[PDB]
Design a protein around this nucleic acid. Structure first.
Lengths: 94, 103, 62, 46, 77
RNA sequence: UACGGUGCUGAAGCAACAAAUGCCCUGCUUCCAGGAAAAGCCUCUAAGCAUCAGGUAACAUCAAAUCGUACCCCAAACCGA
RNA sequence: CGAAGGUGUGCUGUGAGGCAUGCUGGAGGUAUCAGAAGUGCGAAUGCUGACAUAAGUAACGAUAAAGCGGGUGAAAAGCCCGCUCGCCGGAAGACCAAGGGUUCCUGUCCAACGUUAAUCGGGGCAGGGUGAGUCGACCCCUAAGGCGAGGCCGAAAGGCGUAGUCGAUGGGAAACAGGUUAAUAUUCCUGUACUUGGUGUUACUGCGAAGGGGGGACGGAGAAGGCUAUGUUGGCCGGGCG
RNA sequence: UAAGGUGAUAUGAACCGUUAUAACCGGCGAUUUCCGAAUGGGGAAACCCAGUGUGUUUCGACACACUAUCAUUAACUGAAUCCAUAGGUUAAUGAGGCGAACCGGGGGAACUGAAACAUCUAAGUACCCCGAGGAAAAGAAAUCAACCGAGAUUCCCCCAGUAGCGGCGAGCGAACGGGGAGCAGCCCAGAGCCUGAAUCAGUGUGUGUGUUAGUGGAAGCGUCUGGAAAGGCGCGCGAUACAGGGUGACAGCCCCGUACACAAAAAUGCACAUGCUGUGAGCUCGAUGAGUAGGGCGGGACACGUGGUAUCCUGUCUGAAUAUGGGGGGACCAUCCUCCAAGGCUAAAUACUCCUGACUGACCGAUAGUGAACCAGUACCGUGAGGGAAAGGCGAAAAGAAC
């Protein structure tokens, strides 16, 4: 049982990319940016409540931040957690 | 306690537009005002495809120091200095010369 | 808004907070896409939430 | 030719890392000194 | 640590002076000894690492008094 | 046919011989220089509990989180400026 | 109506120097007589920066090796495609650990970086990319060793060490084949599996550990025999008739 | 406090706000991830893994609190062993770590000087360690003095480079006494009377005065040069304000300020005033700090190196008298003088500046001044401790050069 408030905080964004699109189309799997602390179960819960859609399974991974250079000064982008969430057969997501 | 404000008509004490007049357009945190029609510069605006800008020699209003302008008193027909005083529990500006309140 | 929200119960407050959170979430969802063309909204919502939280704390043991 | 530095992360940490430094008085002193100096990287710890 | 429990005698530093006055640092340890002292009131032996001077003091005063003093000082025995 | 590829389709698919330093082998034979530990695992009971829990029996269901996963790796990416 | 500074000129003093003035410069300077000194540089194999010399000289980092056609382009010995040639093949191939930490893939740019050119790049910029119950870590267990309640010892700091607790390089449950991405895969998909936990069950009925026992649990060398990986030949199947 | 705002490189976007919950500034609150004394256990810091309890559940799980060690006190429990004690489990209170210098204590060099070198010097310095405070330490005569007297400690100037010490070398170097800064004295070794009597600490209240935002705050125009006037030349005015900074060149009167006069809902420092809690004052009688003082042996400190060496401290072995007594007066004795050790407390004058504010400089002005005017303890170097740079200036205004 995850708290409503917690759930709302978990899910950061949808992730747009070719791969993501492919996943959505073929495998019925949505690619989300989620909180770095968000566990799989929590993510699933969030998905179910907040998008109103049955979840088969969630795979997560941590994306490491790229090191960049703004002019002369070096600086690193933040790490962030990506989640492939596979929706059950016949579940169409808006 | 700022003697010149957004909608005041001012007269210029110094510079190329000295003697001229104009309504303050806006006042900057740096201690400079931009007055309508006074200090003009012919900026060469570089075109950009986005934002629908054609780009040309645009004549715009550059800033001027607040110290360089003065609040004009319509009655005297001259530039004046501004003082502050409390009328009915509320601070108000007044012309030093003639002692009348700014309204 | 704090003076208005101060005249409320705990339960009432909680619901409001929840609503605010939901709104924020929605905004975030929109923001990520090209839907939200009113960025200040997000800023507002967070502030509101914070205020609500503060109020709650004041009520419960202060 | 086998050169002197032959890196190993665990070894480095055990040797020089924060916890090791903390463990002893001299280590602590070193840390303090570093702090005083204004070092950004107080220890070898990543 | 070589410390008489009754008297508080620690080691103190000093010199060996030779015949040619060659100072070299040395210590002066106290004449410590662990000794079981019979405590007549409690009816048990209390072991104390004590100097010969400490022993003498005890003899003079009474072990009980010494014990009390120690207690006051916050010292286990 | 975006000359990158994509979609459909698809025969036979056996036998003999040779064969490891790999496996049986944590084996066997032998030698003296005489060859880790602890848990998992199996088992025995004590205090206990006593007709409850616990144990094994299948069956149902739920569970398995977290972090790593790119790329180089006898090297142009590591140690040698 | 042009300060200091810079740079010429003229005059002047026995000298250190001084005065005047053209150009440059664009805002400070300072008589006099006193006062105080970070008060004068050619040398210290002085210190810092700049710039020479050798000199457009040596070298351009394995003597595995190139040639041509087409493409793109401002431009092609070097990039892409093609056909030849050559080199490695117990490696100069493939997969990992360690270590690195985005170098991966795509688009784009060629100032600098690349010992030449560069359209190319491990270079610049932007975007994308790392999916696990069963692989590894974590986790349970311990070795060498470390820390170590009390404790023993020590001017202080601290040393040693019991109970314990950490410590892999060792012991401990479980997944395979195929397909797929520009870039991940025993992680995605397809098929077919396995594991050990709870919870609930009906069925039964001695369970229970910080303890006992077993097991785990182990050397070198040698010898075979049985195997498979793998390879060869034949058969088969498809294509071929130079 | 406000008419302007949403920190900076750094614009833009989307917005808020204008007479008062925009923004800004100050008081008191709230929130305050993880690591770090780090404290539930562990650990390769910013990570891994728990236990217990209280609530919830859509019954998959959640949440949030507590759980270090030591010291001390209390409660319960509890061996060998009868009672006990050790031990054990809880509970409460405190501690822990960091920090410039200064301060007290525990340890403690060498280079060097002596033209070598060993006593000696350097020096109780550097350094290490423990502890404390805004200061610390010391402190209320068993002190000096000299037959006159002084009257706790600390600090400054003299005394004096004197007297001394000293391989009588190199060097070290007082005191008495005088002038100043500041000055304060108290309690326990114990019981009688009287009973709340001075003082101190914590803690409320009241007053005064700071501090932490602030408010008002004088008086100038014309003309010439010029890109621009604050400059020149005219004629004015303010000044308890001609400190300083800015403004298109040098401004008392353009701006910000300055002198001067005012200001605090709230928090808080310091003075007195006062309430409450603890603390006991004055009087009489006494009592008057023993392994101590001294001594021997060994060291150390005293300017004083064992010397003819007083005095202090003590590792070691001894060991009085106890006011009819004892200490000291620089070997020692006698006389006299002077003080009362072996229990404590104590403000001031003194030391220092990581830090805050204000002001000043015959201090520097980018190879100077901090290492660092600049995103510097950074880049870079090093396994690590550690080392450690370079680099300021367009213009008045970006008007930063459309085509």
């Amino acid at each position: 049982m995850i708290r409503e408030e917690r759930l709302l905080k978990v899910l950061r964004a949808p992730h747009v990319s070719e791969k993501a699109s492919t996943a959505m189309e073929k495998s019925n799997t949505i690619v989300l940016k989620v909180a770095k602390d968000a566990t799989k179960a929590e993510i699933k819960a969030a998905v179910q409540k907040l998008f109103e859609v049955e979840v088969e399974v969630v795979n997560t991974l941590v994306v490491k931040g790229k090191v960049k250079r703004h002019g002369q000064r070096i600086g690193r982008r933040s790490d962030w957690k990506k989640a492939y969430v596979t929706l059950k057969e016949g579940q169409n997501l808006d | 306690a700022a003697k010149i404000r957004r909608d005041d008509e001012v007269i210029v004490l110094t510079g190329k537009d000295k003697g001229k007049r104009g309504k303050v357009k806006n006042v900057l945190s740096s201690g400079k005002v931009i007055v309508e029609g006074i200090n003009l510069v012919k900026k060469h605006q570089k075109p950009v495809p986005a934002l629908n800008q054609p780009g040309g020699i645009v004549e715009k209003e550059a800033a001027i120091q607040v110290s360089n302008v003065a609040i004009f008193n319509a009655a005297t027909g001259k530039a004046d200095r501004v003082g502050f005083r409390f009328e009915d529990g509320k601070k108000v500006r007044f012309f030093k010369s003639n002692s009348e309140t700014i309204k | 808004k704090a003076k208005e929200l101060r005249e409320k119960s705990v339960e009432e407050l909680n619901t409001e907070l929840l609503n605010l959170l939901r709104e924020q979430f929605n905004l975030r969802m929109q923001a990520a896409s090209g839907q939200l063309q009113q960025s200040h909204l997000l800023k507002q919502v967070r502030r509101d939430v914070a205020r609500v939280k503060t109020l709650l704390n004041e009520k419960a043991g202060a | 030719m086998k050169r002197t530095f032959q890196p190993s992360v665990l070894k480095r940490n055990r040797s020089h890392g924060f916890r090791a430094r903390m463990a002893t008085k001299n280590g602590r002193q070193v840390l303090a000194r570093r702090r005083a100096k204004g070092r950004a990287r107080l220890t070898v710890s990543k | 640590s070589r410390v008489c429990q009754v008297t508080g005698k620690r080691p103190v530093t000093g010199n060996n002076r030779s015949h040619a006055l060659n100072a070299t640092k040395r210590r002066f340890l106290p004449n410590l000894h662990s000794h079981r002292f019979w405590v007549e009131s409690e009816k048990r032996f209390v072991t104390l690492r004590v100097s010969a001077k400490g022993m003498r003091v005890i003899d003079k005063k009474g072990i009980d008094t010494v014990l009390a003093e120690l207690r006051a000082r916050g010292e286990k025995y």
